[PDB]
Amino acid sequence: IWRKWHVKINQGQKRFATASALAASAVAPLLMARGHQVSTVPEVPLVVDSAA
C-alpha cells in the first residue's frame, strides 16, 4: 500500500491547464472534434440568462 498513488502537481500548472481548457472550450471546431453535437448551438460560448 505504500506505492505512490497520488501525484503532486504545481498549482500554477494546474491553473495554466484550466485556462487552456477554458480557451479551448470557446473554439467551436474543437467541440466537434472532441465529439459534442453543437451544430444547433446558436453561439459559442453559449451564455444563457441568469433569470432562467
Binding site: 505504500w2 505512490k4 498513488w5 497520488h6 503532486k8
Partner: protein, 202 residues
Amino acid sequence: GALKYLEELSKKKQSDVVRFLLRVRCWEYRQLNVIHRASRPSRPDKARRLGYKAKQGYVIYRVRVRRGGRKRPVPKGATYGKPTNQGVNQLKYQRSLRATAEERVGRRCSNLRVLNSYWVNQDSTYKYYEVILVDPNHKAIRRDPRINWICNPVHKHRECRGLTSTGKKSRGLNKGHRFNKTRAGRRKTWKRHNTLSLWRYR
C-alpha cells in the same frame, strides 16, 4: 504536631536511638513472616505524607525482599553463545526491590490497590518495606473524592505496570534534556523515531 519531630528524627538514621530501634525492629521483622500485615504504620509521618489515612479501607502490609542483583536461569549458570566478558553474578535488575515488594504484596492482596510504599529497615540479607493499600470496594473509600480515583478500573495493579512512585523513578519520567529517551515512554519514543511516515502528496 509531632510528625515534624518524627521527620527530623527519621532524617538522623545513625543516631543511637534510631539505630537501637532499627536493630530491635529488624530482629522482630526477621522472626515474623516474609509478607505479613502490620496493624499500624511503624513510620506514621512517612505513611501520612505518602497518603495513608486512619480510615477504614487503608491497609498496611510489611514485606522483606532479598537484596542484591539477579541471575539468569540458565543451566549451570553459564551461557552457550558469544562471549560476554562478564558473569551472571553482576547482572542488575532494572526495577527496584521496593517495586518487587509492592508486586508481591499486591499478589498477596489482589482485592486491594497499592497506593505507595516506604523503606523501614534493612540488613545484609533483606530490605524491609511497608506498603499502603486501599480497598476500592469499601464505601468509605468510594464516597471520598480525594481517594475514589483508585476505584476506577484504569488503576488496577499500578505496581505491576510501573504507575507507582518507584515505577516512575525506574521508568525515568522526568522533564528535561537528561531524560530525552524515556520521558514519554521509551518504547513508544523508539517506535515514533523508527516509524516511516509517507504522505499522499510526497
